[PDB]
Structure formats: C-alpha cells, structure tokens
Amino acid sequence: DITYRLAQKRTIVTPLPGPRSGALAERRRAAVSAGVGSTAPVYAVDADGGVIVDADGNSFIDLGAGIAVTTVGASHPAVAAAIADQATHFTHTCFMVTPYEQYVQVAELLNALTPGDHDKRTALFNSGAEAVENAIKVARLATGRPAVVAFDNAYHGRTNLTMALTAKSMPYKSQFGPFAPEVYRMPASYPLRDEPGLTGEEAARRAISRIETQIGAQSLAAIIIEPIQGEGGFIVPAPGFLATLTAWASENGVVFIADEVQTGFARTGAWFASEHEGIVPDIVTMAKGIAGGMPLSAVTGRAELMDAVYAGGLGGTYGGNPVTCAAAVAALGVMRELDLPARARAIEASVTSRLSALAEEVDIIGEVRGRGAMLAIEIVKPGTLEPDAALTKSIAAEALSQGVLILTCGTFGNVIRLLPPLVIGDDLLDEGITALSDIIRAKA
Amino acid sequence: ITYRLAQKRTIVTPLPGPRSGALAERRRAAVSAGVGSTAPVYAVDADGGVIVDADGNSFIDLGAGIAVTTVGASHPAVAAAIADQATHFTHTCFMVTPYEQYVQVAELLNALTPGDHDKRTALFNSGAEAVENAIKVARLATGRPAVVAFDNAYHGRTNLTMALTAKSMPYKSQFGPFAPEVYRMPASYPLRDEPGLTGEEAARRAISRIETQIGAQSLAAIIIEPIQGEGGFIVPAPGFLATLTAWASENGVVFIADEVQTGFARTGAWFASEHEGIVPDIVTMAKGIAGGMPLSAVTGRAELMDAVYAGGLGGTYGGNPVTCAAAVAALGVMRELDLPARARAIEASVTSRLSALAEEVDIIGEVRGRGAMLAIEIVKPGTLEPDAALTKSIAAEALSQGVLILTCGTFGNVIRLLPPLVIGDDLLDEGITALSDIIRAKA
Amino acid sequence: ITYRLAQKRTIVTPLPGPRSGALAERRRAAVSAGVGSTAPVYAVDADGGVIVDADGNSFIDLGAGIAVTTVGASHPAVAAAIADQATHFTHTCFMVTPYEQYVQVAELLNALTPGDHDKRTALFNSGAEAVENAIKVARLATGRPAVVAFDNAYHGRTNLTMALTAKSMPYKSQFGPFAPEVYRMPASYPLRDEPGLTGEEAARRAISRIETQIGAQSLAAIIIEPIQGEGGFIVPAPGFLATLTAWASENGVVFIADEVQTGFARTGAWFASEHEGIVPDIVTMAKGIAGGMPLSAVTGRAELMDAVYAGGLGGTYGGNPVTCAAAVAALGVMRELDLPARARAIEASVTSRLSALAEEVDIIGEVRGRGAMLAIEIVKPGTLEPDAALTKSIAAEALSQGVLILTCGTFGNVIRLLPPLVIGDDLLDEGITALSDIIRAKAS
Amino acid sequence: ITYRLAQKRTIVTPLPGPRSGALAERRRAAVSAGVGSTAPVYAVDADGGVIVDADGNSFIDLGAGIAVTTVGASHPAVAAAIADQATHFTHTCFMVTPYEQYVQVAELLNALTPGDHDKRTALFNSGAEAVENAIKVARLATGRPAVVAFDNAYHGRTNLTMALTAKSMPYKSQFGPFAPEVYRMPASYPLRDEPGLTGEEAARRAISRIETQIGAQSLAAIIIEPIQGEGGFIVPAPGFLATLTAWASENGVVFIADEVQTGFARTGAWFASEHEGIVPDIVTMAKGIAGGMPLSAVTGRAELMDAVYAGGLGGTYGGNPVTCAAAVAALGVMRELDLPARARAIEASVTSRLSALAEEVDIIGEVRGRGAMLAIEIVKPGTLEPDAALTKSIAAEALSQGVLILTCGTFGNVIRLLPPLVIGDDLLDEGITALSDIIRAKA
C-alpha cells in the first residue's frame, strides 16, 4: 500500500509541447548549449510515483526514471524531508575540511550492502563518471600497474578517461580526444550477436587470451565491466562469463571493478546485479539510484585497496555532499522498507512474459532481455538480426505522443529499454506496457 | 538576533571532544584512508561565520568549505529553495525531461559573466566536470588537439583535470598515465619571478614558448585561473592576462578562465576576470554558485557552445533541479546583500591588518589576493625559502584556538583566508587577531 | 647461378664450436642481455643458401636473416655496388646535399608498387621508421588523429610501432606508456576464426567496429600486413583486404600496406598486395629492398606524400647512398633472375611436400603462405591447441642438424620458411627433408 | 694528410648547374616534397674538406652531413672495411645469427664512454632508434613511467623522439598525438637566461619543477644533449649537468646523455660529457660512429642494460655487419689521427677568429660551442632579438661562394660549424674567411 501525492494517471490534453512548455523551450534554446539536447519537448513541474506532470498539466507515464535514477520515485516524501532537514543545518562543509556523520552513515550502509563479507571502505563523489575515475585511481595506485581493460558495448561516462573507457563514439566521444592512455578494449559477451551456442566461459576465455597476448597481466591494473551493459543495450552476459573473468583477475592480481552505476540499488531484482552472477567485485562503482535523484556517487572496495591511497589522494570539493547523503540514507531506507528488490523481481516476471508473447506475434523483436526492472527489447528487420534504429526511434516517439515516456539505447541504436521507478503501480505500469505493445503491433 | 547560530567562538571540550571522537572511530572503520580531513571535529551546524561541532564547540569559519559557502553554509533562502524543489522533484535528467530551473540558472550565468556578446551555458555537478566540458567544447569547436595549462595551476581530480593540474602530491602521483596533449607553461608569480618582470613580458615569454613548442594551429585552448587558488592565491602581474587573451583571439585559440574558486563575489566582483578587463571565451564555475549544493557550469560564446552536436555534452545528474533552485536563491542573496561590495570591504580591512603584521614579524614574505580571497606566504626570515612546516603549525594552533584557517601553495607555505561573506565584522576581526597572535608567537 | 661457397650442409664440430664459443664469451661480456640470438654459432660468411660459421660448419639458411637476404647474403653485384659507392661517399645527408642514388631508388619503387597513379617516395633506415613516417603522412594529410592496427600485427620496436604491434612479449612489455589514439581491430585468421567465415564478412565486422568505436571522421589510417609475418604467416581469407580498401577509399581513410616482410619477390610477386588485387594508398618497405643493407621506404600517392611541408620528413642517415646503391643492384638481381617466378616454384614444390607431411602426422594444424613465405602451424593432436614448446623443440633440433629455421606466431607455434630465393633446388630439398624427418620423429 | 679529391673551391657553372638541374627535375618527380634539401646541387664525390657536385663544382664542406663524416666522407680505410665485409655477408640479423663485428663495436664503445664501471651496448640504425631504446631500458629497469626532456632539445623524428624534441616546426607539427608521460623542463641557455644565473641554480630550478610536477618516484629518466645541437649549439652554464646527475643518482632516475651529435671527437674529447666531469648512466650515439654508415648505439650501466628480458631490444637491421666494419675502421682513424686533439685545435683557432669578428660587427650576439662544434648566434643590432632571415641569407650567400654552412636554432638564427676533422688548415681558414667577409658585408 503506497500513498501517492499526484494522481497516477496518463493525461494528455494539449498539443505536445503545450503553450507553457513552448515558452520554456524558447528560453532554453536562447540560454542553453545546443550540445546538451533533451529527449522530451515538454518541461517538468512535478514527478511522483509513476508520473511526470508538465508545465501545461499533462501527465506522462514515466518508464525511464530519469535514466534509472528515481527508483524510489522522483519526489519521495521521506527523501524530500531528509533533504530539507539537512539543508537547514548545513548544505556543505567539504568533508575533507570538516567531516560529518552523514558521509560516514552512507559509507557504512554501502560497505554492508555490496557483495562479500570481507573488510571494505567507501569514498564518495558526485557523479558516476567521478566514481569510475576514482575506482581506476585506486586500482592503478594499489597495483602499481598502468593498463585498464574495458569492453565492447561499454559505457562509463563523459569525462576524458570515462570517454576512453566507453565503446561508442557517437555522441559520447567523437571530436573530444585525444583520450587517456593505456585503455584497451576487449570483447565481452553479447549472446544475441555472438556465435550461436557460445558459452560464457568460452567468451571469457577468448577475452582472457587476448588480454594475456596483448597486455600481459603484469601491466594490467584493472578490468572494469557493467554486470548488465546499460547504454550498450541492456546486454546480459552469458552465464559463467563474469565468474570466469573474476577468477582470472584474482589469480593475476588484477583489480576487478563492477560498474553498478545503472544496475545498482534494487534495479535488477537484487541490491546489486553482481549477486545474480555470484561474483564479489574488488571495487563497485555506484551513482544513479543511490540518493533518490540527488548528485551522489560512491566507490566501495576491499579495504586494502581503498586504504592504499595516501591521505588527500582521493578528493573533490563537493563529494559526499551532506544534503545528498541525507537523501541516500532515506532512499536506501525506502528500498528496504518497501522491499523494492522484490518489486523489481515481480516486474521482471509480469513484463518479460508480456514482452515475450508480443515477440511471438510480431516479427520486429529480435530479443527480450534484462533482469528485474532493467528490461529491453532489441528491434530488428523481419527475419534477420539487422538493427532497425529508425523504427526504434519511431516507436519511442509515438509512445511519447501517447503520453508514455520510454527511453532507447544500444550500440546500434535499436533497443527499447524499460526503467520504471519501482514505486510505479501495477495498473499504471500495465497501461504503459499496453500502449507500447499497441504501437509495436501497429509498426509490425 | 538575525543569525541562526550564536556568532561566537566557543571551545569548551578537548579537541576532538567525545562525540566527535566516537564519529571518528566510525569514520576510520568505513571511509577510505585516501580521503582525509583537515579538522578532527564533526560538524552538526554551520551558519554565518561559525561551525558548530558534535560536542557543541563553535569554530570561526575562515574557509567556507574551500570558498563554497560564500552566502553562508545554511542560508535560510537557500535552504527553503532546496526544500521546496525536492517536494516537486529531485531529478528528471535534463537530457530526458527538461525543466525551468536549469534554464533560469543558464540565463543568470549568461548575464553575469564578462562581455555583452551572445553566450550559452551547460551545467554539470563538479568543477572538474565543468573544466572537462570546457576542454571538450574548445577541442570540438577548433578541431585542434592541444591544451595549455600553467605552473601553479589546479583544475581537479579527474584524469584530464589531474593532467591540467601542476602539483603532483597529493593530486596526481601514481594515478596516471594522463590525458594526452596537455602542455605546461610558465605564467606570472610576482614574488618568485624575476624582480621587476612586467605582466606583459611574462605573457610574451609564455606566448613565445607556445609558438615554438606547440604552434597556434595545434592549440585548442589556454586554460588559467585568474587568481591561482590551490597554487597559493597567486595574482598575476598586471597586463599578463590581457596579453594572453589578445594573442589567443588573434590565433583562434579558445581562452578559458577557470573561475571555479574566484567566481561569485569572492574577489570583490562577480568574476575575477573583471579586474583584469578580460572577456574570457569560456568561463568555468562551481563552488560558490549554489550555496553549497553540487552544481557547476560552463558559460561560453554561443558559437563555441553550440558547435557541439546534440548529446555531446552530457551526464545524468548535471544541472540537478534542487541544486538549481539553490543557485537561483544563492545568486539572489549575493545581489541583495551586495556581497561583492562586502568582499571589497573585507579586502580593505584585512589587507591593511595583514600588511601591518608583515612589518612586525619576519616570516611573512607577501600579503596578496583580492576581495575575500586573501593570503600570506610564509618564509624563512630574510629569505623567500618556503616554510611549509611553520605554515602547518600556525594553522593547527589556530584550529586548537577555535579558528578554522586553510593552507595551500605549490610549496605548502601559504595561509589563505576564505571567509563566508556573511561573517560579521566583529567575528572576522576576532579570527584575524587570533591568527596574528599565533604568527607573532611563532616569529 | 654460380655460387661463391659450396652449397652443402656440413656439421663437423660441436655446436657451438670452439671459435663460436670464444666469441659468445666476448658477446656476453659486452652486449646487452636484452638483445638475444636464435643461433649459438657466429657467422663468417653467408652465400646462396648457406651460412658458414666461425668453426667451418655450413648451415642451410631457411631464414634469410628474417626475410632480408632474398637475393642471397653476399650477392657479388650487391657487394660491388656497395664497394663502389663507398669510394665516392658514404653519406652527405640527402636533406643537406642530395644525390642521384636516392632519386634512382625512389623512381624504381614508384614504378614497382601497385597502381598506375602518381606516386612519391621517402627513404629511411628501418622498417619501423618507414611505418612511423607512413603514419605521419596519413595524419598530416587527413588532419585526423586515430590509427587502426589489427590482431596478430607486428610493425616494429619504436614506441609508436610497439603501439601498433599486437603481441606484448617480447615486443612491448614494460616499455610503455604507448603512443595515443591507436585502436586494435580483428582481421582475418582463417584457421582460428569461425569456420566458413568469408573475408568479406571478416572485413564487415572490422568496419562495423571501426564505425562504432572510432568513426571515419577521426580515422587517419588503417595499417595492415598483406600476410601477417611475426603474427604467424597469416594469409587473410579472400576478399578481406579488398573490402577494407573499398571502405577506406569511400571514407577518406589512408590505407597502408605494410610490406616490410612481404615485399620484393618474397610472396611470388613484387608485392603481396598484387595477389589481392589491391592498390594501397601507402606501402612501407624494408628487409629485402637493399640485399641486407639498412634501407627502408615509404611509397605513396603523390597527393598524400606531398601534403607534408618541406623538412617534415627527415632523419640524418635515411636513403644512405651506399644502401641505395645496394638496392639498385638487388632489385636488378630480382628482375634478372625473375625471383618472383622462383618464389612461385618454391611455393608449388614446398607446399605439396608440407601438405603430404601434414596428412602423415597429427601435429600440423595448417600449411599456409605464398611464394617463399611459407609456414606450418603446430598443434596438439586432434585439436587447434597451440604447442609452442614442440615448435621450439623442432626448430632447435633442426639447428643441431645444420638447418636454420625460424619460428613465429601470436601463440609461438608456427614454423616458418623464408629461404633466400637464390637457394638451389637440391639444398632446399635437403633442408625440407631434414625438417620433415624431425617432425615425423616428434609425431610418434 | 693525403686526399683523393682536390682540396679547393671550384665554382665554374651556375648553381645549380645543368647536371644538377636535370637530377633536380627527376627528384621533384619522384621524391616526397616533405623531405627537402639545403643545397640545390647533387653530390658525386665527397672527401677531406670538399663536396664535388654533378657539374664539377667543388664546395668547402663545413657541415659534415650534419656532424656525421667526422673522419671524412670517403675515408679509404672506411671504404675498404665496407667493401670487404660486403663480400662475406651484408646481413644475417644479429638476433638470428650473431657475428664478431657487432661484438667488436660493443667492446669499443663500452671502453670509450665515460666511467670505469661495468657497461653493455646494444646497436640500432638511427640516433632516433638509440634514444627510443635508451628510454625503453630506463622505463623497464626503473619500473617508472615519466621522462623529462628540455627546452631547446632535439632527439629525432619518431613519435616518441618527436615528443622529446622541443621545437614544433618542422619536427612535430601535425604528426601527433605524441607518446605520453613526456615532461619538458627548462635547462641552461646562458645568452637568454637571467644574467649571471649559475649552472647550479639553473639545475636547482629544473629539479624543483621536477619534484613539484612529476615526483622522483614516477620519473624513469632525464635525457639531455651535453651541447644542444639543432636547438642552437647551446652549451650549458658550468655546473648545470653535474647538479642534475647528482640529483638523478640520489633519486634512482636514469640519466641519459644524448651524444648523437656531440659524440666521437667532435667536441675535443671522445664524448662531450667528459668536459662536464659527468658519467651518464646511458649514452646514445649515432652520426660520427660509422664514418657515414647507418649505425647507432646505446651504451649503459650493465645492471640497466641487462635488466631487459631477452628479445626486448631488437630490430632486423641493427648493428649491421657492414656498418660495424665501417665503425671499427672510423674509430680507428679517430684514434690514429688523434681527431679529438684536432678538434681542440680547431676550437682555439676558429673561436678566436669568430670572437674578433663579433667585436667588429654588431649582428653576432654570441660565439659559442666546443671543439669542432661551434656557432654564432645572429641578432638585430644592440639587442638579442633573433634574426633568422639574415642567418638564412648569410648561409645562402656562402653556398654561392662555394662554402656549405648549415644553420640551426630554436629561433632559426644560429650559423653552425661542423667541419670534417680531416679538413686541412688552409681550406678551413678559407671557409671561415669567406663566411667572415659575408658577415661583414651584411653588417
């Protein structure tokens, strides 16, 4: 039993964008860099439960959660109350100047929540990119080795190094280099497009062989991978792939970094997606869902790695902001109290079965995949695995016109993803999935 | 009657006290040793010119969280704006579903930054991210690879911002290899440069080296702080920056003023670039912008900022709507209270006291800075040999006396003053007197 | 052919013998341990198909000093040209005072390389320097930063050529960090790729990855060996290279054929590119060019080669007049004796013997190559699992029997044949019979 | 000494003449425009102090092919050794089948380089390859990433040696991005540095910057030319190099003396390091080593050179046996004729003439260099403003008079003298007089 602040309804009753959104768009185009861009042409005034309400009073079904961020809802009252309260005491002291309990609380929670029973420590930053940057810093300093491996279909951020680590050039990297050195890309696992029948273990062995031939373990500080590749297309590795990699890394003194920026915090039907794989990452990176929408990120890793860095080596002015920490303590509480991991598993069950039935009735769905509330359909030309990015975009755009916000992704631009807030109601989620299904049938 | 906390220095327990000590045991068990903190006490409230710790001690705050809480660390208008926005939405991702608060901040920054030309803004979370994105814009817009940064510079802790940062320890050491095609040049450091060197000559020396070693046709950008912050509050010789900007303009090189620390009233103007009469092609901002909340900005010529293809400037959290609400409020407070004028008054009163102290002792090599960004460089008597150990000792003794004062510098020997601009005259005077007494004792 | 030395295999002392042993003691006391040598005997003469050591042993030379002494290691016309030029001048620095010998080599190479289009040449000393300068031309001419190299590639031992080289040990390990904006892609390796994979499809896979991860607009050059040499004498599937060159041409990307090892009669044509029907934008050359002397060349489209400002391509020694005289003489010998035809005859006779041998034993996974650049890949029986130890043991046993045969391979399990093309039928037959007997002994 | 060619100037056709003109047409049709040549005439013979062109003109050679043909460009012992080796074998690849000639050169260089400690050598083809391999040894042996090079340095035209080289045009521009973790530092340039700056202080300034910006624990190597060649024949202030080598030793940093240009009799000693009293950990060599043939060498402490795993230093052609035979012969000639002593005599006589000339004109800012590596820096009268255009015009006019003289310099305003050491006194004098007359005419 969840109580909502806003009516959980889809309501589209003006042109899109409406008049007030249009006036805002004119101001936006006059003031904001064209390099930014936005998926939706409407401007938000409220977001609660499973809806976004725009400046003209339209109410959209939110199947994006701000790209997997507002897992607890975009204005959860406990999160809002924690934010307001902390801000009355202090917005900022800089933890590296005058520390505070809120940062310590978050570190404690994350140390306990991440995989493994071993001794761990945490450092907090603002963005997921900063978390990745700092995990790489820890691995390089602790091992004394220079190279880092990242994978095909990877996405890790928009800083120079996280661009280096990211696989796709457009729109993340193109014209923004040259890039941070000693980053090597390897093949990972992509079941749909890899050789038929390839096992996870064999996919891992092929990557290991390439690493040994082309880099050498003695020069490799770290392997970084997303347990489910997010922007690359919600790619779930073949069973056995990740465990095979982690075993090799452990044998070779290489730090294994699981990038759980998108998969972390209930999203995949577990606290962390690494749990489904049985792996215990040496370092985990986190952001998005952590703080109920506020800018917080985290690096949680084996104590001996995290404490290898000299005092002052991990830094930043804002990181572990006390208001964002208060938001995180509250958001993590909500996840526990409402058992949002269980809710994600319920969503996997109901949505995957609907999408699988839809795939049998049309010919444009190449695969239904994902876990928990991180689910996707890959869109292809009938009778092939040829990507159809144009159709993907058209489906997403038609859904928006019908009042349902659905994101896309993928190395080839042809994946419709589903990232609802986990506090969405059954009826509104069903309405959104039905609207999408009708659009897919119409296109097929 | 107006402040929320008592504007008093109150030290009535050992430091750290018992509640801080218990928090510190927790902190050492949970938080990476790579982080570290200046103070051993844990904050529960910060307001006006004070920080109150978990044991009820009250410290005079001459750091502002490293130049961040310019409007105070819990300004009630900032607090109310944060609270209010959070009830509506914490986040939609501006790149997914946009919102007015981001647009408002962009409008405010386009208006506030130097120059009357057409500008656009993009928002991120940290100062390092702002610098990263300024470099991305310059590189894409010019089609050129190289970037120049300077001796004594500091720009952040990401791989590229480490590359752009001069000092290795603790910012860079063991964290490379670093982003390529970054070239370091000499800038202006009047105390330590050749006696009588003009800013124009210092700039011509840098320009000559740039032309010889890089070539304008390969250079996307020159990035410099108008007053170098972590490097030691180094104010360039007059004429230096204008000489550089003129060359950059003539050669199609993007000039980026990194105002992350200097920006927003701090130096007695909205931006420190104003003192120099320069109009930077791009300005980077963070710290003071949002009254303590994590927001950063890149404001630049429209033709540069709009050269980037849609989706090329990105990030999930950037321009967070709660942080934007905070910024709108914080910028309002700066205007309403005329905090630039306040910084100018602080410059006048504090610089004269510090200059008098410098004549009285023999360990102050220079008093420098502008507005409420003021510093003394500590040296061995009769020399300009840095004394970092003494610098550290003075700051630690100040802390034991209830006054939080930060240090910095390429050579670790600069005591800096970064008060919140809402500090009262009497409490600021008390803090400066306590510092002066400690400096006299050490000299 | 008249030979200077008796074309006989003669092993009549311990190996190494006493005089080689005294040289080896001096060598260990004076020469870096980082260098290393395959053979423990010290050369005093090399002619036709033999190497005569300091103790009078005569070895059958199936290596040609790693594909260098194609015209033989002391051809009298090459020696005469070297002697004559040294009497006039050893060096003036072509960039200071030019000379006809450099111009003559440039003219010969412009004529001999693929295509009828306008070309220019620049001369250097080593193959690595040629590759460096081909990359310099491509980067300057295109104004683009990135370069693509491939799995199994080898291009040299300078920092950038190490970057371009795939295998870490012993070429790269501990010698970084490496030159930036080098990206590695899969090429074609028929034995180890998916069974049935066409060259066109292998090329499409590389192209897709290049488009996704780099973007043509950032790509100055693709560099590939037409037959990968140190990587294991890997011949691409038919259609692979043409598919690449077509894409490169369409996208303004400079295509560089690294013919340092394949060049000059070696593969049964002047250039291996001819077998593929491709016309590279730039060709890099060294090894066989100057009958053993240190010369290398970059020959490319005039518009590319002349895009570089005067003084931008340089070096003190490059196009050394004595080495140029050697090259004019060597190229003359290749023409006069029709060494490409001789390479074709060696392919016919040796490939059929080696293929018969492969049916008789169970440790030969593949016989491959073209002309006199031929290889057998050694595997564990009934598998494609590499056997580097056995490969090494075969080569070592051959050396003990007076036959110098080199190895190579990404996995260290390729026995290669690189005879001088002036070897006699009888001595070549003897060498192959000795190798076969050893392989038969090991297959039991 | 007896010569093969007439030791005189002979200018009896237009320059270029008809045969050189025909060759130049062929050259422009066949050779990349990126190469370029100083002289428009084509060589058929070079011997002693002269170069004879395709039309029978004879030039006084004051360049030695850029400091290469120190023993003369066709010394008969060198030519005979070359001929003789080629009849036995041109190449076996030392890494496949080794040979005595490589061992002989390694032994000679181990003995000749500074210090009495245990050393080993590896051979390559070019000076750039020697520098590449010295950096490889230093990085592997120390396990550290960074390399320091200096203002005004030149080390070669490969990607990494371009990175190490200071001047962009024509060595680097548009050829990047460059090998990472190369840091440039100031060295010593007496003419243009602060008046009175000591070498020790110049080194202390570089050391300070290194410690601040890199940290010894990340620094594999410092590489410097004992006299910077292409940068303008810059001789460091006394004490500079020794101060650096002391610091490197104390901090585990490999010090590499790049003697590619200074090496082998050129500066009045076997190696220019001798004049400075330093013992470099690694020396790089090429140019004069093999009497014009393509050989280069890396000679270093045994513990450093042998730290590299077998096969880690390589190349197909390196230590070519014909080039090794040339080197044994050339080094023999240098010993037999005491060419280091000859270089000291040249220094004495030429420096005194050039210094007198500098007193008489107003366009020579400095006379500098050692041995037969001598230079005049050309400036605008009453200033140190470079005059590159005048420098070029002097060299061009000398060529028209039958004297081949090279230029160089960071600012393109240095006339250099690099004669072969077998040039006769009368011909060298004639060359210097022709140059002097031209310089007088210009002043």
For residue C406, give Cα distances in angstroms to A288, C40, C421, D123.
56, 14, 16, 22
Phi then psi dihedrals of residue D360, to 5 deg: -90, -30
User: Where in chain D are the domains?
Assistant: 1-74+339-443, 75-338
Provide DSSP, C333-372: HHHHTTHHHHHHHHHHHHHHHHHHHHHH-SSEEEEEEETT
Q: Measured between beta carbons, which residues in chain D are less than 8 angstroms from residue A181?
A: 180
The CATH number corresponding to C75-338 among 3.40.50.360, 3.40.640.10, 3.30.300.250, 3.40.1380.10 equals 3.40.640.10
For residue D441, give Cα distances in angstroms to D358, D384, D397.
13, 20, 11
Q: Which residue has the tokens 């494609």?
A: C384
In sequence order, what are the beta bridge partners of C66? none
- Classified by CATH at the fold level, domain C1-74+339-444 comes out as Aspartate Aminotransferase, domain 1 (3.90.1150)
For residue C139, give Cα distances in angstroms to B124, C133, C299, C302.
34, 10, 16, 15
CA D421 to CA C409: how far, in whole Å?
Answer: 49
SS3 B301: strand
SS3 B197: coil
CA D102 to CA C62: how far, in whole Å?
Answer: 22
For residue A49, give Cα distances in angstroms to A6, A52, A77, A79, B180.
8, 9, 11, 13, 45
- Cis previous bond, D420, omega within 30: no
Q: For chain A, how are helix, strand and coil distributed in percent, rounded to 5?
A: 40, 15, 45
| Expt. technique | X-ray
SS3 B168: coil
* Of B416, B428, B436, residue with least CA distance to B375: B416
Contact B216, B197 (CB under 8 A): no
- Cis previous bond, B177, omega within 30: yes
Q: How many CB pairs under 8 A join B and D?
A: 60
Phi then psi dihedrals of residue C226, to 5 deg: -60, -35
CA D256 to CA C148: how far, in whole Å?
Answer: 33
Q: Is C180 on the interface with B (CB under 8 A)?
A: yes
SS3 D224: strand
Q: For chain C, how are helix, strand and coil distributed in percent, rounded to 5?
A: 40, 15, 45
- What is the Rg, in whole angstroms, of the alpha carbon atoms belonging to chain C? 22
In sequence order, what are the beta bridge partners of A223? A149, A256
* Of D123, D143, D138, D33, residue with least CA distance to D320: D123
Q: Which residues of C332-359 are buried (b: 16+ CB within 10 A; e: fewer)?
A: bbbeebebbebbbebbeebbeebeebbe
| Chains contacting C (3+ CB pairs below 8 angstroms) | A, B, D
CA C199 to CA C246: how far, in whole Å?
Answer: 13
Angstroms from D240 CA to nearest CA on chain B? 20
Question: How far does chain B reach from its first CA to its final CA, in angstroms?
Answer: 39
Phi then psi dihedrals of residue B180, to 5 deg: -80, 170
Take residue C381 and report the two structure tokens written for it.
């029986």
Burial class (CB in 10 A: 0-12, 13-18, 19+), B250: exposed
- Report the alpha-carbon angle A102-A103-A105, nearest 5: 65
Phi then psi dihedrals of residue A151, to 5 deg: -125, 165
Take residue D259 and report the two structure tokens written for it.
């003697």
Question: How many CA atoms are closer than 13 Å to the CA of A98, on its beta-carbon side?
Answer: 36
CA C358 to CA A157: how far, in whole Å?
Answer: 52
Beta carbons within 8 Å of A33's beta carbon, 6+ residues apart: B120, B121, B122, B137, B298, B305, B306, B308, B313
In sequence order, what are the beta bridge partners of B379? B386
For residue C226, give Cα distances in angstroms to A133, C188, C277, C297.
39, 11, 11, 17
Longest dimension (CA), chain C: 63
Residues of D (396-415) whose Cβ lies below 8 Å from C = 404, 406
In A272-404, which ranges are continuous DSSP H helix?
A: 274-277, 303-306, 322-337, 340-361, 389-401
CA D276 to CA D235: how far, in whole Å?
Answer: 10
Phi then psi dihedrals of residue B414, to 5 deg: -120, 125
CA D399 to CA B53: how far, in whole Å?
Answer: 82
Take residue B289 and report the two structure tokens written for it.
């912008």
Query: For A169, which of C151, C181, C215 is closest by C-beta distance?
Result: C215
Q: Is D29 on the interface with B (CB under 8 A)?
A: no
What is residue A240's DSSP assignment? T
* Of D233, D322, D333, residue with least CA distance to D288: D333
Q: How far, in whole angstroms, is CA D391 from its chain's centroid?
A: 20
Sign, CA dihedral D353-D358-D359-D361, equals positive
Question: Contact D168/B194, CB-based, under 8 Å?
Answer: no
* Of A177, A36, C298, A25, residue with least CA distance to D35: C298
Q: Which amino acid would we find at residue B125?
A: N
Number of H helices, E strands in chain D: 13, 15
Q: Which residue has the tokens 């057409």?
A: B118
Q: Which residues of C360-380 are buried (b: 16+ CB within 10 A; e: fewer)?
A: ebebbbbbbbbbbbbbbbbbe
- Cis previous bond, D16, omega within 30: yes
Query: For C79, which of D29, D35, D86 is closest by C-beta distance?
Result: D86
Provide DSSP, A146-158: -EEEEETT----S
For residue D116, give Cα distances in angstroms to C25, D112, D280, D281, D286.
20, 10, 11, 12, 22
Query: For D176, which of B151, B181, B410 is closest by C-beta distance?
Result: B181
Q: Which residue has the tokens 């011949």?
A: C235
Burial class (CB in 10 A: 0-12, 13-18, 19+), B2: exposed
In C46-192, which ranges are continuous DSSP H helix?
A: 64-67, 76-88, 100-112, 127-142, 159-164
In sequence order, what are the beta bridge partners of C375? C368, C416
Q: Which helix (H) or strand (E) holds A369?
A: strand A365-371
- Is the domain spanning A76-339 CATH 3.40.50.2300? The answer is no
Q: Is C209 on the interface with A (CB under 8 A)?
A: yes
3-state secondary structure labels for all residues of C204-247: HHHHHHHHHHCCHHHEEEEEECCCECCCCCECCCCCHHHHHHHH
Question: Contact B97/A44, CB-based, under 8 Å?
Answer: yes
Q: Measured between beta carbons, which residues in chain A are less than 8 angstroms from residue B91?
A: 66, 69-70, 74, 292-294
Q: Which residue has the tokens 């199936």?
A: C62
Question: How many CA atoms are closer than 13 Å to the CA of C68, on its beta-carbon side?
Answer: 31
* Of D252, D21, D257, D248, residue with least CA distance to D141: D252
* Of B390, B386, B374, B381, residue with least CA distance to B431: B374
CA B185 to CA B177: how far, in whole Å?
Answer: 20
Q: How far, in whole angstroms, is CA C34 from its chain's centroid?
A: 22
Take residue A11 and report the two structure tokens written for it.
């309501």
Q: Is D221 on the interface with C (CB under 8 A)?
A: no
Query: For D180, which of A144, A177, A181 is closest by C-beta distance?
Result: A181
CA B442 to CA B432: how far, in whole Å?
Answer: 15
Beta carbons within 8 Å of C396's beta carbon, 6+ residues apart: none
Query: For B122, which of A36, A100, A292 is closest by C-beta distance?
Result: A36
Phi then psi dihedrals of residue C374, to 5 deg: -125, 150
SS3 A12: coil
Order of strands across the sheet with C43-47?
Answer: C43-47, C50-53, C58-61, C403-404
Contact B159, A130 (CB under 8 A): no
- Cis previous bond, A115, omega within 30: no
CA C282 to CA C256: how far, in whole Å?
Answer: 5
SS3 C75: coil
Order of strands across the sheet with A51-54?
Answer: A44-48, A51-54, A59-62, A404-405
CA A319 to CA D139: how far, in whole Å?
Answer: 36
Sign, CA dihedral C350-C352-C357-C362, equals positive
In sequence order, what are the beta bridge partners of A53? A46, A59
Q: Which residue has the tokens 């004019």?
A: C328
Q: Which residue has the tokens 């033709």?
A: B303
Q: How far, in whole angstroms, is CA D367 from its chain's centroid?
A: 18
Take residue B303 and report the two structure tokens written for it.
């033709």
Q: Which residue has the tokens 């007049």?
A: C321
Take residue C77 and report the two structure tokens written for it.
């016309």
For residue C353, give Cα distances in angstroms to A235, C428, C440.
49, 12, 13
* Of B333, B321, B238, B318, residue with least CA distance to B276: B238
Take residue C330 and report the two structure tokens written for it.
């060597």
Q: How many CB pairs under 8 A join C and D?
A: 432
Q: Is A170 on the interface with C (CB under 8 A)?
A: yes
In sequence order, what are the beta bridge partners of A115? none
Count of C-beta atoms within a 10 Å radius of residue A53: 20
CA B339 to CA B351: how far, in whole Å?
Answer: 18
Take residue B249 and report the two structure tokens written for it.
């303009």
Q: Measured between beta carbons, which residues in chain D are less than 8 angstroms from residue C164?
A: none
Residues of D (43-72) whose Cβ lies below 8 Å from C = 43-47, 51, 53-54, 63, 65-66, 68-69
What length does chain D have? 443
> What CATH architecture applies to the domain D1-74+339-443?
Alpha-Beta Complex (3.90)
SS3 D5: coil
- Cis previous bond, D340, omega within 30: no
CA C180 to CA A411: how far, in whole Å?
Answer: 24
Number of H helices, E strands in chain C: 13, 15
Q: Resolution for this model in angstroms, one decimal place? A: 1.8
- Substitution target in B162, B212, B411 with the highest count of D β-carbons within 10 Å is B212
Contacts 24+ apart (CB under 8 A), D108-113: D108/D327, D108/D328, D108/D331, D109/D285, D109/D297, D109/D299, D110/C30, D110/D299, D112/D270, D112/D271, D112/D331, D113/D270, D113/D271, D113/D280, D113/D283, D113/D299
- Name the closest residue on chain B to residue D412, using Cα atoms: B212
Q: Measured between beta carbons, which residues in chain A are less than 8 angstroms from residue B36?
A: 96, 311-312
CATH superfamily of domain region A1-75+340-444: Aspartate Aminotransferase, domain 1 (3.90.1150.10)
Question: Contact D90/C322, CB-based, under 8 Å?
Answer: no
